Write a protein that binds this ligand. Structure first.
Ligand SMILES: OC[C@H]1O[C@@H]2O[C@H]3[C@H](O)[C@@H](O)[C@@H](O[C@H]4[C@H](O)[C@@H](O)[C@@H](O[C@H]5[C@H](O)[C@@H](O)[C@@H](O[C@H]6[C@H](O)[C@@H](O)[C@@H](O[C@H]7[C@H](O)[C@@H](O)[C@@H](O[C@H]8[C@H](O)[C@@H](O)[C@@H](O[C@H]1[C@H](O)[C@H]2O)O[C@@H]8CO)O[C@@H]7CO)O[C@@H]6CO)O[C@@H]5CO)O[C@@H]4CO)O[C@@H]3CO
Ligand code: HEM
Ligand SMILES: C=C1CC[C@H](O)C/C1=C/C=C1\CCC[C@]2(C)[C@@H]([C@H](C)/C=C/[C@H](C)C(C)C)CC[C@@H]12
Length: 465
């Protein structure tokens, strides 16, 4: 029958278990998998859920049974936000196919498929490093600047332009949207999805989320209107124009899935997916480089050898920079920016390893448990970039590294994120030495959210050459 799992209280089930725990949810789930096995169940206030732990079960579900596990759960929060339309939380089906295909094609065509695109990223690193330089080595929080810089890469693809670092209205929208990604992980929202009548209560994190989402929605529709002003039909300049072309071609198809709503949802999703995740990867990398100056120095040694101290970083340099690549992958493995992926659901009744999983069951992919899977990793609890180097000193790709997930829903933005991570990291470490103020003791415990981000920390960036 159904997979077994820990017991919890009546009504609220394992929401109590997760909330009472001293461990963050993904850690709690990995430990429970040592007791009940690789696939176990949680009851989240009456919502029946299975958790997939370790490389093998995750791959068996997302890859071997790719169609069956490619759906999204109809949680009240998600139904309320996007009606299971758009792209990121779209039901597995025609609408998802339509939006996925459009987004994938737009990212190549308006983005990295064009010769001039990398130079637009480099211009962003220059805007970004110049802003860092203005602090003149005094301690500050990088979060805002990194967020601006990274969101701008996708802005180019979506809106056809970057926005300046004085655009406080755009930055405010992103701040509320990011708050929502964090609130989505709270006990308040787990309880809301279990007992949606809690919406009657006016105070709480659930009302903070709903209010933020209304503000963000309006802002996004106004950005999309402005980006469509000078549109030339069938000659799109960006994802918005391309979306509008699609709506025109499907005007007489009534089952066409493209819509004004779905444009706002899919745009919002593309914006927050990229901005939240890539930002946090860089924020974790900087923390660990300041923490471990010998590792920071090896990276800088390699930059100087390959790029030179004044040469412009290029994506083609990556294959000559194995240690830089090792460090970036080890930040992804170790820091787990998306620890529990995005929740899946079964699109039909499933059988996995003898256990029955009924249609619509929520499926949590514990990606953290894959990256700490001792069948595949030696001492996964240790941060060790050199685990990614082969006996000739070259970067070695590992099957059980899946920070972008696997299967049908695997990260659409992976290639772009990898370019951004590499070019921003190297441009930054080429120009500055990074360390903490007064060598101060920084906190490395992540915040609770749907992504893992560090607590606020100051860093001193000092010009090198
Ligand atoms: O006003 C009397 C009120 O009585 C009943 O409510 C009780 C409730 O059921 C209990 O749970 C408890 O409430 C405590 C609550 O659980 C705590 O979370 C807390 O609140 C903090 C929040 O955590 C934090 O988010 C923030 O609160 C902000 C809200 O999130 C935000 O939405 C906004 O709230 C405003 C609302 O937009 C607006 O509705 C208006 O509120 C009126 C209500 O519409 C109306 O129902 C009635 O409230 C009754 C209610 O019916 C009973 O269930 O009158 C309200 C007029 O005041 O205005 C809101 C105020 O801004 O802004 C807030 C900013 O605070 O911060 C708080 C910090 O405390 O503490 C609660 C302790 O009370 O008890 C209450 C009654 O005591
Ligand atoms: C370090 C950077 C990033 C990481 C680690 C990351 C990770 C992930 C993960 C784990 C998923 C879950 C897929 C699943 O459901 O199993 C995902 C989905 C997704 N990501 Fe990313 N991501 C990154 C950057 C980006 C960027 C920059 C964009 C867009 C500009 C993006 C767009 C998306 C979209 C649209 C989905 C949902 C796709 C679908 O449902 O079909 N991601 N990502
Ligand atoms: C799609 C939108 C934009 C317009 C409106 O505000 C409604 C809306 C909400 C989006 C949300 C709110 C809930 C939490 C969502 C679903 C996030 C979910 C939990 C996914 C998070 C993963 C980890 C991403 C960030 C990589 C992404 C989009 C967020």
């Amino acid at each position: 029958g159904f997979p077994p799992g820990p017991p919890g209280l009546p009504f609220i089930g394992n929401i109590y278990s997760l909330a009472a725990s001293s461990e963050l949810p993904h850690v709690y789930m990995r430990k429970q998998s040592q007791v009940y096995g690789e696939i176990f169940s949680l009851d989240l206030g009456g919502i029946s859920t299975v958790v997939l732990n370790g490389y093998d079960v995750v791959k068996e579900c997302l890859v071997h049974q790719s169609e069956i596990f490619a759906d999204r759960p109809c949680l009240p929060l998600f139904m309320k936000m996007t009606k299971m339309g758009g792209l990121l939380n779209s039901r597995y089906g025609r609408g998802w196919v339509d939006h996925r295909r459009l987004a994938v094609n737009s990212f190549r065509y308006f983005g990295y498929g064009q010769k001039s695109f990398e130079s637009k990223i480099l211009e962003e690193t220059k805007f970004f490093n110049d802003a860092i330089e203005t602090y003149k080595g005094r301690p500050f929080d990088f979060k805002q600047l990194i967020t601006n810089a990274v969101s701008n890469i996708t802005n180019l693809i979506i809106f056809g332009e970057r926005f300046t670092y004085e655009d406080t209205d755009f930055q405010h929208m992103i701040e509320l949207f990011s708050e929502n990604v964090e609130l989505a992980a709270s006990a308040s929202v787990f309880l809301y999805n279990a007992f949606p009548w809690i919406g009657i209560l006016p105070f709480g994190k659930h009302q903070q989320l709903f209010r933020n989402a209304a503000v963000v929605y309006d802002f996004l529709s106004r950005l999309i209107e402005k980006a469509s002003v000078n549109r030339k039909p069938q000659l799109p300049q960006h994802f918005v124009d391309a979306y509008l072309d699609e709506m025109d071609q499907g005007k007489n198809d009534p089952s066409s899935t493209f819509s004004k709503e779905n444009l706002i949802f899919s745009v919002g999703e593309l914006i927050i997916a990229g901005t939240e995740t890539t930002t946090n990867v860089l924020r974790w990398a900087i923390l660990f480089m300041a923490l471990y100056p010998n590792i920071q120095g090896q990276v800088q040694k390699e930059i100087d050898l390959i790029m030179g101290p004044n040469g412009k970083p290029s994506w083609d340099d990556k294959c000559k920079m194995p240690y830089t690549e090792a460090v970036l992958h080890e930040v992804l493995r170790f820091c787990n920016i998306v620890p529990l992926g995005i929740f899946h659901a079964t699109s039909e009744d499933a059988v996995v390893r003898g256990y029955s999983i009924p249609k619509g069951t929520t499926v949590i992919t514990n990606l953290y448990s894959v990256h700490f899977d001792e069948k595949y990793w030696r001492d996964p609890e240790v941060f060790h970039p050199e685990r990614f180097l082969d006996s000739s000193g070259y970067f070695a790709k590992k099957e059980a590294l899946v920070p972008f997930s696997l299967g049908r829903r695997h990260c659409l933005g992976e290639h772009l994120a990898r370019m951004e991570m590499f070019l921003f990291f190297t441009a930054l470490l080429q120009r500055f030495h990074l360390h903490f103020p007064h060598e101060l003791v920084p906190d490395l415990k992540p915040r609770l959210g749907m992504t893992l981000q560090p607590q606020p920390y100051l860093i001193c960036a000092e010009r090198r050459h």
